Amino acid sequence: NEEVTFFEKAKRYIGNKHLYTEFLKILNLYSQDILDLDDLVEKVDFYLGSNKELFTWFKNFVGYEAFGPSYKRLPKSDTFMPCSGRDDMCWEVLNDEWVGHPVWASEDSGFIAHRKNQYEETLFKIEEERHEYDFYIESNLRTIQCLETIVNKIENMTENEKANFKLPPGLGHTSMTIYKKVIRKVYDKERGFEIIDALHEHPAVTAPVVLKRLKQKDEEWRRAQREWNKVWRELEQKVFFKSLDHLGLTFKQADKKLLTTKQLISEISSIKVDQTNKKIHWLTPKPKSQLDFDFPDKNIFYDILCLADTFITHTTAYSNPDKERLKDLLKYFISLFFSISFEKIEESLYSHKQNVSMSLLDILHRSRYQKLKRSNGNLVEEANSQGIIQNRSIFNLFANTNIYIFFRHWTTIYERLLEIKQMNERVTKEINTRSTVTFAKDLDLLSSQLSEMGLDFVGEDAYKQVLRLSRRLINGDLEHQWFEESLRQAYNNKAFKLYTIDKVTQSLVKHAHTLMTDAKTAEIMALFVKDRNASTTSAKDQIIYRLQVRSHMSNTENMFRIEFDKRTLHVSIQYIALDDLTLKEPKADEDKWKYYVTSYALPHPT
Amino acid sequence: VYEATPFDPITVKPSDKRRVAYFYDADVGNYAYGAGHPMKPHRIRMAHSLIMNYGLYKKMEIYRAKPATKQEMCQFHTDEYIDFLSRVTPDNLEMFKRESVKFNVGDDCPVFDGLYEYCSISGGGSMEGAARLNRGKCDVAVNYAGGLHHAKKSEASGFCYLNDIVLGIIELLRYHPRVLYIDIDVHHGDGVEEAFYTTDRVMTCSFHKYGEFFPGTGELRDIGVGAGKNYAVNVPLRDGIDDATYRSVFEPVIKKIMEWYQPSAVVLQCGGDSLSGDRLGCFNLSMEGHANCVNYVKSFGIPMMVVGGGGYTMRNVARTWCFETGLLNNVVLDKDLPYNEYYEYYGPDYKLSVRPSNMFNVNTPEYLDKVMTNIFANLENTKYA
Amino acid sequence: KISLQIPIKLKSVLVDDWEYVTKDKKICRLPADVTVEMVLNKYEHEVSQELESPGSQSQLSEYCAGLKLYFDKCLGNMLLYRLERLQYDELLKKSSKDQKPLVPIRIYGAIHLLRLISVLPELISSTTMDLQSCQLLIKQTEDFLVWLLMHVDEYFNDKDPNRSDDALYVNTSSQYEGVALGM
Amino acid sequence: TPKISLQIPIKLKSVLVDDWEYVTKDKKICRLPADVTVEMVLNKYEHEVSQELESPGSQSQLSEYCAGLKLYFDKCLGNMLLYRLERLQYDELLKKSSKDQKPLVPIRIYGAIHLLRLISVLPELISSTTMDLQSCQLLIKQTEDFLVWLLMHVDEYFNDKDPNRSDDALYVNTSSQYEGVALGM
Amino acid sequence: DSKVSVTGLPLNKGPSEKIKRESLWNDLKTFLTENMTEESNIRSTIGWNGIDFENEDFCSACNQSGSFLCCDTCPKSFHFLCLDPPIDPNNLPKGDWHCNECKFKIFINNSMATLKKIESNFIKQNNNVKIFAKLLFNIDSHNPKQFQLPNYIKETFPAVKTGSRGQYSDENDKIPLTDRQLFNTSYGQSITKLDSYNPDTHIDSNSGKFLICYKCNQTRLGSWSHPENSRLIMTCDYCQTPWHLDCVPRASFKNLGSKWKCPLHSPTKVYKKIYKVWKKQRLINKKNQLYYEPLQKIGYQNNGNIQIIPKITQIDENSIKYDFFDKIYKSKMVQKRKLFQFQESLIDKLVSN
Amino acid sequence: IDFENEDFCSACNQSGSFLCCDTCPKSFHFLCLDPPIDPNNLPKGDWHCNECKFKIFINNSMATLKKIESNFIKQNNNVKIFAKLLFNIDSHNPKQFQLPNYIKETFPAVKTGSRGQYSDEDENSIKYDFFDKIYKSKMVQKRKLFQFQESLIDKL
Ligand SMILES: [K+]
Ligand SMILES: [K+]
Ligand SMILES: [Zn+2]
Ligand SMILES: [Zn+2]
Ligand SMILES: [Zn+2]
Ligand SMILES: [Zn+2]
Ligand SMILES: [Zn+2]
Ligand SMILES: [Zn+2]
Ligand SMILES: [Zn+2]
């Protein structure tokens, strides 16, 4: 009675058939007493584990050695090897039974390695040459000291003791192959063997000549060592930091490939389908809008406007009137949307540019801006009665793809600049206290190439230095490589995000241009202006807004709703499923059903 | 049961005062693996120069361990392999063409010069330090020449020819009931795990990168067989592990281990291929994120021993071992390096800083939650020691 | 051409052996409990009481003796995989120590005899026998094959040598796979 | 295909023998309709034993085999159950049912003696079909347990109580009509 | 010394003019340790005393490479374990060593009449096993080999194929990777472990929709201005059901050894731990795998070797439903009556006191 | 070619007034068939026994035979265990009821001969799980009754 329903529930949950086929095969393997019981429970937990009630009912209803895949067991005939010094304990404690190996733990073919980009390869080569020279130097010295002491001890005797003196194998030292290796390196290995047995036989005639040969070779090798130490140090300083960022060489190609339109809508589509496919599970509450941005610091906007103004004054793609229209559109939009007074914008630009030493709709229909700048039953009644929002604080904007991608670019730039402006305090305090020891200053051991061109973060502040350097890059006053290197050494390889601070600005300018060159988006922004300038509204007015803006683009295009909260300076972006709630889902039956029966008043369908 | 945290700097404890011993054989650096071969004992010479130019010799005793003899290496190995080691040299290699294949020392771990000599030095260091720990005239025993945890019983594999970790640990086991081996190398120490896989007097704890990565061994489900079940902890991680992640994983798992297993002696293998900018490992640790583990294990205050390990770029490993010996004498070393013979190694700033990369840490808190929950589930059964 | 009809379960056993001795790196645990001499003796002894005529008994004993002699002269030559020859060779050496010659009929289990039978068609087709003897030998061999197919319940169990013990197969150490394969 | 056998108690075999003796020598023919049909017999069977079986599979198999015996018995009644004598009774009842606007269902008239007949014949029927080993083994197990229950409740309908009464004993003597048209008059 | 080293030049020479043009822009305290280093011998284990042809380049027996003991007559070459008998490598008999073929040819003096004669004599001698007579004469005319199953046992099963060196391959071998020789030639720092870029791994290729994890029902693409929210989707290799590495607790992308098998498959080996073994046969194709749909439904045993329909048994969902409920119901009642009888036994035993 | 007719009705293996098929050699009584047909209401045209009808039905094609048997055991999938029997009677020939020799080997007082005489000397699962649970409930109640009976015996 309840179990037919169980098999129907299982077929529903699994959703597919091949996986249901395997589910039934598990069940039958259990049925013919092949599978254990709790092995069946564990095998089904991979199927009905995302459900709690179904699997707990299954638990209450069904009434519920080399376990490591790396080792083998050898017979007790491979554990029989001499092992002389193995006492009674090293038999009881150690293990001779089980065996492992990286040739059959890798399945006879494997062992990938990391990538280790080219600059680390050159650094490794430099370190290897260093090690080689150091090894030969130290070995030559280590044999020279012993040969010197035996020479100094052997000459103080008479001719008789010299004639009968001989050295035992090892020269009385603790190592036996050092001097052999050194002499075979320097002395023509055949001649090296004959001279080494001559040294073992009669040192009184062979030790001085080998000693002086080793001395001259040592001084030659040391001269070569310093003359190569110069180049080693210079190349190591050239390519050290370039090798310490595993993302910085692939950010100028990841911020141009993962910052297109497809990906930009794809992340929000993905969080949407996640919300639905996981909302099928009923016990979870209904999730609200897709994306969340938060804007606690308002001063970066003037910096973004400064970057945009710098680009537009530099670029040659647009003509001067177009440049002014772009500047004024950006200024007024970011003053209106984020509710920043234009007078405060002008005071901020006053504070900014003095240290370097009509409405928005008037711009929407560009002719207006040209003229301006050349002049210089009871149900619906009682539903609309209660709930009137006075002193509007939460605003909304209904947008096609262009406004959304533009606001996306804006948020990307703001988030990157806020990252580095949150690091600024500590990184500046650190770079102010660089304790450079003069012992490296005098020996030319420090590279002042970054300090000579002024790109070094001297005790001036760091964030303003980033802004100024990025502006110099945008103008074309500084190459990309040196800006990158300044940002590597200055902060760390921790601030790699700002290598594309000019391309993202160019993209934001292109989108601010599309935001008024198109006709549909111009009218959508005009409706946005008309709603934003309003100070009080009702749900019916919001439905009029949504339907009017949807009337502009076709029934195949997407639509996004940007909900701006002025009390806490928040932005919430919602993907609009064409027949989803134009406002956010509440929790009250009252609000929901009265909102829909007031939408019923308009002749548009439900 | 994992939870991310910040990383406060390393602070020395005043009460935990130890008499350290530092073992160095003046010849360890004169045995060259070869032209380009990724292992050099040279890094021990540099580490030594850094350790002694800080004036750290006034804080600890410096010894020279007598190299091991053929009848003490065999406390782990088989006698035919030991005799091959003693006889083989780059000239007679064509003479043992049927033995170079059986023991796997012809090309993978080649014969260069003084192979038996370097192995004897390392084994002697390890065993002598373990013995000085026993008789009670020390608390720590530093040795950067040992730590060859890849060498098997009758074959070398992974540039490890004498598995001196095991000889030293056996020398420790001759008096001590329980030994805990903490392995923070980026690779898996399959030698010291397979060698003590079925025993309950030795507990290994190995924090290694798992993937298609050498030695391809060390899953989460390898908790020993027989009487050594739940007495082998493997923590397999992913790339890019950083200081805060590694600390938030290492601190709780090790506190639980030392809370239930309660070892009487520790062997910490602080290899240095788990650092950033290395040659074969893929982690992204910093010099302080690697010495935090040593400081935490020292915080417990039981007989301890620091061993060497991997380390394929010499400068980071030299500076790391210098800083670890520094905080092992209960001082936080100054970050400005003094003048040493190998000064020109430590470009470009000439300070005691190892700098992490911006590598992407791919260890999500859900994966580490799963892993540490599995590991605590296993560890539930190692209480009655 | 000549053709032999192996039961499908014996083909599955031969392919399982191909798995175990090839890339699973296992060898046969020698000397196995049930060898070729004992198997052929039990078969010839239990089938002997079937037919009364002397021709049947004579042909049975002749086939069994000839098959044991071909097993002796063939196992070392062509019935061992590459991975497991060293084992054989080691036994060969351990024979020369005690001055007792190696004849595999008493040491090697049934699976190598199964391999012999499996390859017997080509061995037959390469010589210059007549047409009658080929077919009579093939018929005797197929009777043996159905005998074995009925008796697979005792000879070819699967026991996972890594798990408990005493399986038909054993694991190889790294030294063995180094010297046997990579010589 | 196999050589399968059905262990039937000798008491029911003796009942078969005395039935043949009553229909061949004195040619006493069974009464149509019987006191209780075969539908009632199999229904009493499955209703008495379905309330003594635990698992759903056992009860599914019980009901399936009972319905199968119904279908076969009412299907094979005309081909292999009756002797030469009652074929006349069969044809006259068939023509009566034909003029009664509906075809006959042989489970409505006959009784347990013909069911025992078919059950005793069943082993050869199974043996001539390609039913595999487990299927036919289940068949004969079901049938064996059924006929064991039949032996257990032989008393109600098999032994003719008050044999002098023609209405109680289902065997009635034939008139000269059947005595003639049986042996060819 | 004039011998070039790894540095590129002899050791007694500074950088050449070329190198120092593209790698440019335009007391101590280790005097000690011969006063502080002191010998330590407190160890416990101190008492321990301590036609000009050329031979082939592949083994004539197993067709591989290694060390070859060649013949002078023929271009054949053999390993040391693949000889008759296998020869120990050190004590190798010097001189003119011939293989079995060449020795047999030189023994008959390359005349076939003597071959007929000796073969006839061998037939006459071995009269006891005459059927196997001629066979036991050719065993000494072939150089040894290694055993390869004939093609009519490899071709009875279709999912079993000879590897590169004649090894077992059972469709669970992933593939050889030639485009990973191209990964050796890698197209930049876009790793084959699939890190730092996962928009195209959370997206179905052919369809265009999203690869969803079976356990969490989310394709956590995150947002690639905050890449710390991806979750490393990987698709299984049999059922193509994609999982997160945090859901199937594995932490790697299986790339080399085998095909990854989802946690949604029923096993191909059990170890019931009575212990007992396998329940699944091989796939005996070439169209000799007969399917038999039984007439019995609720009691058939038949193996673990079934096939599901709406010697391979055929079975439908209803039969599995009924067998499963049968199992658990009769097991429940069995254990219930067992505990009932045991507790009543305990009661009657205790009241007896 | 006209074959010969056997004067014995294979249903009773005795002679009399009978009719035969056009393709089958044996004849049968008018009342030996099912339905037993009147001797005067003869079938129109050529009449065959079950065997020849089956032959012209299968067209001597084994594939059709297997197809019909499989789809028949699928039609009778409610009564599956009997299906293989139910398909065969649709093609067999009727014969008199004679229990095989295996039955009468027990009593020697009976004699028989060639004369054929004897001489004296879905809701399905719901209903089935319902049956299951009700029987199990009844039986566990009877088991606790067993325990109470035992305890009552201990009340002696
Ligand atoms: K252990
Ligand atoms: K490790
Ligand atoms: Zn390592
Ligand atoms: Zn070979
Ligand atoms: Zn030759
Ligand atoms: Zn997941
Ligand atoms: Zn899968
Ligand atoms: Zn008749
Ligand atoms: Zn006919």
3-state secondary structure A399-442: ECHHHHHHHHHHHHHHHHHHHHHHHHHHHHHHHCCCCCCHHHHH
In single-letter form, the type of residue at position A191 comes to R
**Residue in the structure block whose two tokens are 């008059």:** D185
Residue contact B101–C178, C-beta within 8 A: yes
Q: Which residues of C26-62 are buried (b: 16+ CB within 10 A; e: fewer)?
A: bbbbbebeebbbebbeebbeebeeeeeeeeebebbeb
For residue A54, the tally of other CB atoms under 10 A from its CB is 17
* Whether F122 contacts A4, CB under 8 Å: yes
* Whether A559 contacts A400, CB under 8 Å: yes
Helices and strands, number each (H, E), in chain E: 6, 8
Closest CA to A331 of A343, A314, A319: A343
Q: Which two tokens stand for residue E250?
A: 């594995």
Closest CA to A47 of A23, A27, A30: A23
A189-201 vs A178-186: helix crossing angle, rounded to 10: 130
Q: Which residues of D touch E298 (CB under 8 A)?
A: 57, 60-61
Report the chain A residue with the minimal C-alpha distance to residue B71.
Answer: A85
In single-letter form, the type of residue at position C135 comes to Q
Determine phi and psi for B211, rounding to 5 degrees: 170, -150
For residue B91, the tally of other CB atoms under 10 A from its CB is 8
SS3 state at A484? helix
Domains and CATH numbers, chain B: 20-385 (3.40.800.20)
Rounded Cα gap, residues B92 and A549, in angstroms: 87
User: Residue E265 C-alpha to ligand 7 middle, in angstroms?
Assistant: 7
Rounded Cα gap, residues B297 and B275, in angstroms: 19
From E295, E325, E343, residue closest to F81, measured CB to CB: E295
Q: Domain A4-61, what fold?
A: Paired amphipathic helix 2 (pah2 repeat) (1.20.1160)
* Whether C77 contacts E84, CB under 8 Å: yes
What is the distance between the terminal CA atoms of chain E, rounded to a whole angstrom? 105
Q: Which residues of B touch E88 (CB under 8 A)?
A: none
In single-letter form, the type of residue at position F24 comes to C
User: Residue B271 C-alpha to ligand 1 middle, in angstroms?
Assistant: 21
Q: Where are the beta strands (DSSP E) in A216-320?
A: 291-294
Q: Which two tokens stand for residue B228?
A: 């050594």
**What are the residues whose beta carbons fall under 8 Å from the beta carbon of D30, sequence distance 6 or more?**
D23, D86, D110, D111, D113, D170, D171, D172
Helices and strands, number each (H, E), in chain A: 26, 6
Name the burial class of residue A331, with classes exposed (0-12), middle (13-18) and buried (19+) by CB atoms within 10 angstroms of its CB.
Answer: buried
Residue contact E320–A31, C-beta within 8 A: yes
* Whether B25 contacts B147, CB under 8 Å: no
Closest CA to B212 of E258, E213, E184, E186: E258
Protein residues placing their CB within 5 Å of the ion ligand 5: E 71, 73-74, 98-99, 102
From E298, E323, E329, residue closest to D54, measured CB to CB: E329
In single-letter form, the type of residue at position E219 comes to T
Q: Which two tokens stand for residue D78?
A: 């005309």
Q: How is residue A105 annotated by DSSP?
A: T
**Rama region for A561: left / alpha / beta (φ>0; ψ in -120 to 50; rest):** beta
Rounded Cα gap, residues A484 and A486, in angstroms: 5
Q: Which two tokens stand for residue F98?
A: 């004679």
**What are the residues whose beta carbons fall under 8 Å from the beta carbon of D145, sequence distance 6 or more?**
none
For residue D39, the tally of other CB atoms under 10 A from its CB is 14
Report the chain A residue with the minimal C-alpha distance to residue B69.
Answer: A85
Rounded Cα gap, residues E266 and A40, in angstroms: 9
SS3 state at A435? coil
* Whether C26 contacts C171, CB under 8 Å: yes
User: Residue E245 C-alpha to ligand 6 middle, in angstroms?
Assistant: 7
SS3 content of chain B, % helix, strand, coil (to 5): 35, 10, 50
Report the chain C residue with the minimal C-alpha distance to residue B157.
Answer: C174
* Whether D42 contacts D48, CB under 8 Å: no
The resolution of the experimental structure, rounded to one decimal in Å, is: 3.3
Q: Which two tokens stand for residue B381?
A: 């059964």
Q: Which two tokens stand for residue E154?
A: 């490899």
User: Residue B188 C-alpha to ligand 2 middle, in angstroms?
Assistant: 4
H helix or E strand, kind and range, residue E60: none
* Whether B365 contacts B249, CB under 8 Å: no
H helix or E strand, kind and range, residue F60: none
For residue D24, the tally of other CB atoms under 10 A from its CB is 19
**What are the residues whose beta carbons fall under 8 Å from the beta carbon of D12, sequence distance 6 or more?**
D116, D120, D147, D150, D151, D154
How close does chain E come to C146, measured CA to CA in Å? 17
Closest CA to D116 of D14, D35, D5, D4: D14
Rounded Cα gap, residues A449 and A464, in angstroms: 21
Q: Which two tokens stand for residue C137?
A: 């030998």
Q: Which of E320, E326, E344, E353 to mutate to test the interface with F (most CBs of F within 10 A)?
A: E344
User: Residue E236 C-alpha to ligand 7 middle, in angstroms?
Assistant: 4
Q: Which two tokens stand for residue A397?
A: 């904007």
Rounded Cα gap, residues B83 and B69, in angstroms: 12
Rounded Cα gap, residues A561 and A396, in angstroms: 7
Rounded Cα gap, residues B378 and B229, in angstroms: 9
In single-letter form, the type of residue at position B14 comes to P
The verdict on B74 touching E (C-beta cutoff 8 Å) is: no
Q: Which two tokens stand for residue E85?
A: 């008998």
Find the ligand nearest to B232 CA.
1
Rounded Cα gap, residues A58 and E309, in angstroms: 25
Cite the DSSP H helix spans in B261-310.
287-300
Residue contact F136–E333, C-beta within 8 A: yes
Q: Where are the beta strands (DSSP E) in F30-116?
A: 110-112
The verdict on B239 touching E (C-beta cutoff 8 Å) is: yes
In single-letter form, the type of residue at position A433 comes to T
Closest CA to B116 of B139, B140, B92: B92
* Whether D56 contacts E326, CB under 8 Å: yes
- Say how many residues make up chain D: 185
Domain over E51-147 is classified CATH 3.30.379.10: no
How close does chain F come to D133, measured CA to CA in Å? 12
Closest CA to B11 of B249, B243, B296, B284: B296
Subunits with 3+ Cβ pairs within 8 Å of B are: A, C, E
Q: Which residues of D touch E295 (CB under 8 A)?
A: 131-132, 135
H helix or E strand, kind and range, residue E263: none
In single-letter form, the type of residue at position A24 comes to L
Vertex B275: Cα angle to B270 and B277 (nearest 5): 150
Q: Which residues of A touch B280 (CB under 8 A)?
A: 113-114
* Whether B153 contacts B77, CB under 8 Å: yes
**What are the residues whose beta carbons fall under 8 Å from the beta carbon of E268, sequence distance 6 or more?**
E278, E280
Q: Which residues of A touch B348 (CB under 8 A)?
A: 236-237, 240, 446-447
What value does the CA radius of gyration of chain C take, rounded to a whole number of Å? 17
- Say how many residues make up chain A: 606
Rounded Cα gap, residues B351 and B336, in angstroms: 5
How close does chain D come to F152, measured CA to CA in Å? 27
Report the chain F residue with the minimal C-alpha distance to residue D90.
Answer: F36
**What are the residues whose beta carbons fall under 8 Å from the beta carbon of F106, sequence distance 6 or more?**
D10, D13, D14
Report the chain A residue with the minimal C-alpha distance to residue C29.
Answer: A75
Rounded Cα gap, residues A79 and A98, in angstroms: 10
Vertex D116: Cα angle to D113 and D122 (nearest 5): 145
SS3 state at E265? coil
Rounded Cα gap, residues A221 and E13, in angstroms: 8
Subunits with 3+ Cβ pairs within 8 Å of F are: A, D, E
Domain chopping of chain A, boundaries: 4-61, 119-239
Torsion of CA A12, A13, A16, A18, to 10 degrees: -110
| CA B183 distance to own-chain centroid | 6
Cite the DSSP H helix spans in A359-400.
361-364, 366-375, 378-385
CA distances, B84 to each of B66, B106, B119, E303, F100 (Å): 22, 11, 13, 55, 87
* Whether A278 contacts E216, CB under 8 Å: yes
Rounded Cα gap, residues E119 and E125, in angstroms: 10
- Is cis: bond before F35, omega within 30 of 0? yes
SS3 state at F19? strand
The verdict on E322 touching D (C-beta cutoff 8 Å) is: yes
> Of B150, B187, B188, B290, which residue is the catalytic one?
B150
Name the burial class of residue A358, with classes exposed (0-12), middle (13-18) and buried (19+) by CB atoms within 10 angstroms of its CB.
Answer: exposed
Rounded Cα gap, residues E217 and E231, in angstroms: 12
User: Residue E233 C-alpha to ligand 6 middle, in angstroms?
Assistant: 8
Q: How is residue B274 annotated by DSSP?
A: S
Beta bridge partners of A563: A396, A572
Q: How is residue B93 annotated by DSSP?
A: G
Find the ligand nearest to B274 CA.
3
Rounded Cα gap, residues B18 and B302, in angstroms: 10
How close does chain B come to A38, measured CA to CA in Å? 18
* Whether E108 contacts E87, CB under 8 Å: no
In single-letter form, the type of residue at position F140 comes to V
**Rama region for B371: left / alpha / beta (φ>0; ψ in -120 to 50; rest):** alpha
**Rama region for A559: left / alpha / beta (φ>0; ψ in -120 to 50; rest):** beta
Residue contact A240–B347, C-beta within 8 A: yes
The verdict on E225 touching A (C-beta cutoff 8 Å) is: yes
Closest CA to E83 of E72, E92, E74, E75: E92
Cite the DSSP H helix spans in B202-286.
243-260
In single-letter form, the type of residue at position B287 comes to M
SS3 state at A604? coil
- Say how many residues make up chain C: 183
Q: What DSSP line would sit under A505-570, residue for residue?
A: HHHHHHHHHHHHHSSHHHHHHHHHHHHHH-S-B-HHHHHHHHHHHHTTS-SSS--EEEEEETTTTE
Rounded Cα gap, residues C50 and A412, in angstroms: 92
For residue F102, the tally of other CB atoms under 10 A from its CB is 14
* Whether B299 contacts B262, CB under 8 Å: no
**Rama region for D7: left / alpha / beta (φ>0; ψ in -120 to 50; rest):** beta
* Whether A1 contacts F129, CB under 8 Å: yes
Rounded Cα gap, residues D13 and F102, in angstroms: 10
**Rama region for C160: left / alpha / beta (φ>0; ψ in -120 to 50; rest):** left
Rounded Cα gap, residues D21 and F111, in angstroms: 10
What is the distance between the terminal CA atoms of chain C, rounded to a whole angstrom? 38
Q: Where are the beta strands (DSSP E) in chain B?
A: 20-23, 61-65, 140-143, 179-183, 202-209, 232-237, 265-269, 306-307
Q: Which two tokens stand for residue A415?
A: 């988030």
**Residue in the structure block whose two tokens are 């790697």:** E252
How close does chain F come to D29, measured CA to CA in Å? 14
Protein residues placing their CB within 5 Å of the ion ligand 2: B 183, 185, 206, 208
Q: How is residue E258 annotated by DSSP?
A: B
| CA B39 distance to own-chain centroid | 14
**What are the residues whose beta carbons fall under 8 Å from the beta carbon of A73, sequence distance 6 or more?**
A66, A97, A98, A99, C161, C162, C163, C171
Determine phi and psi for F118, rounding to 5 degrees: -120, 135
What is the distance between the terminal CA atoms of chain F, rounded to a whole angstrom? 94
Max CA separation in chain B (angstroms) = 59
For residue A246, the tally of other CB atoms under 10 A from its CB is 26
Instruction: Give yes or no: B42 in active site.
Output: no
H helix or E strand, kind and range, residue A341: none
Q: Which two tokens stand for residue B289?
A: 């994120």
Rounded Cα gap, residues A508 and A502, in angstroms: 10
Closest CA to A414 of A301, A494, A263: A301
Rounded Cα gap, residues A505 and A501, in angstroms: 6
For residue F107, the tally of other CB atoms under 10 A from its CB is 11
**What are the residues whose beta carbons fall under 8 Å from the beta carbon of A582, sequence distance 6 or more?**
A542, A543, A546, A561, A576
- For the four alpha carbons of A447, A451, A455 and A457, in that order, the dihedral sign comes to positive
Vertex E347: Cα angle to E342 and E351 (nearest 5): 150
| Upper half-sphere CA count for residue F72 (Cβ side, 13 Å) | 15
Three-state SS annotation for E135-192: HHHHCCCCCCCCCCCCHHHHCCCCCCCCCCCCCCCCCCECCCCCCCHHHHCCCCCCCC
| Upper half-sphere CA count for residue F7 (Cβ side, 13 Å) | 2
Determine phi and psi for D146, rounding to 5 degrees: -60, -55
Are chains D and C in contact at 3+ CB pairs closer than 8 Å?
no
Rounded Cα gap, residues C23 and C25, in angstroms: 5
